[PDB]
From Swiss-Prot, chain B:
The chain holds residues 499 to 548 of 1273 of the full protein. Binds to host ACE2. RBD also interacts with the N-linked glycan on 'Asn-90' of ACE2. Cleavage of S generates a polybasic C-terminal sequence on S1 that binds to host Neuropilin-1 (NRP1) and Neuropilin-2 (NRP2) receptors. Interacts with host integrin alpha-5/beta-1 (ITGA5:ITGB1) and with ACE2 in complex with integrin alpha-5/beta-1 (ITGA5:ITGB1). May interact via cytoplasmic c-terminus with M protein. May interact (via N-terminus) with host bilirubin and biliverdin, thereby preventing antibody binding to the SARS-CoV-2 spike NTD via an allosteric mechanism. Residues 21-43 are annotated as: Disordered. It comes from the Viruses. Attaches the virion to the cell membrane by interacting with host receptor, initiating the infection. The major receptor is host ACE2. When S2/S2' has been cleaved, binding to the receptor triggers direct fusion at the cell membrane. When S2/S2' has not been cleaved, binding to the receptor results in internalization of the virus by endocytosis using host TFRC and GRM2 and leading to fusion of the virion membrane with the host endosomal membrane. Alternatively, may use NRP1/NRP2 and integrin as entry receptors. The gene is S. It comes from Severe acute respiratory syndrome coronavirus 2 (2019-nCoV). This is Spike protein S1.
């Protein structure tokens, strides 16, 4: 409900070091191929981050309906960015409960 | 073993085939049929139907 | 044996580290790619080097 927004600008962007920072699977993108980030270049880069459950992952996609997509975080009709998700069972869970 | 799920080892076997231009050498369980000619039949010659 | 982020790189028409400089597939590639996890047989607590 309170995702952070970080503006990235006026810097050299190397997208090949993204895989080393976090152990995800694939670099899912919609308007651009994941292969060809480095040769082209953009105007501004925005970063948004939040922690969800494993069922409501496909709701973060352009044109979806649910609970996360309707009241918490909605993507536009024409999204030209990338979405990344990975499991975090080892750093984000307690036996009593993560409240 | 304490690494994440994206840094796990993955054994990979890539089976690469080539299309049939040479006489065929490798394939499996399809029973052969005695050849009959001069009749409108269905044939299966090395993987092509007609 | 590769890393989990590089399983997607075994595909025609892609770049990266494996597809560029280590193992490249052709653009007209036909065939199947079989990949499975091997953390039990190819990992050590001291480190597999």
């Amino acid at each position: 409900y309170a995702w952070n927004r970080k503006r990235i600008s006026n810097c050299v962007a190397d997208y090949s070091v993204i895989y080393n920072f976090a152990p995800f699977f694939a670099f899912k993108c919609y308007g651009v191929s994941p292969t060809k980030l480095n040769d082209l270049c953009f105007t501004n880069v925005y970063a948004d981050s939040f922690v969800i459950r494993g069922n409501e992952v496909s709701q973060i996609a352009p044109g979806q309906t649910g609970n996360i997509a309707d009241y918490n975080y909605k993507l536009p009709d024409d999204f030209t960015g990338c979405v990344i998700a990975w499991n975090s069972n080892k750093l984000d869970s307690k036996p009593s409960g993560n409240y | 073993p304490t690494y994440g799920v994206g840094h796990q080892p993955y054994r990979v076997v890539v089976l690469s085939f080539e299309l049939l231009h040479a006489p065929a050498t490798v394939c499996g369980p399809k029973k052969s049929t005695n050849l009959v000619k001069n009749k409108c039949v269905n044939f299966n010659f090395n993987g092509l139907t007609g």
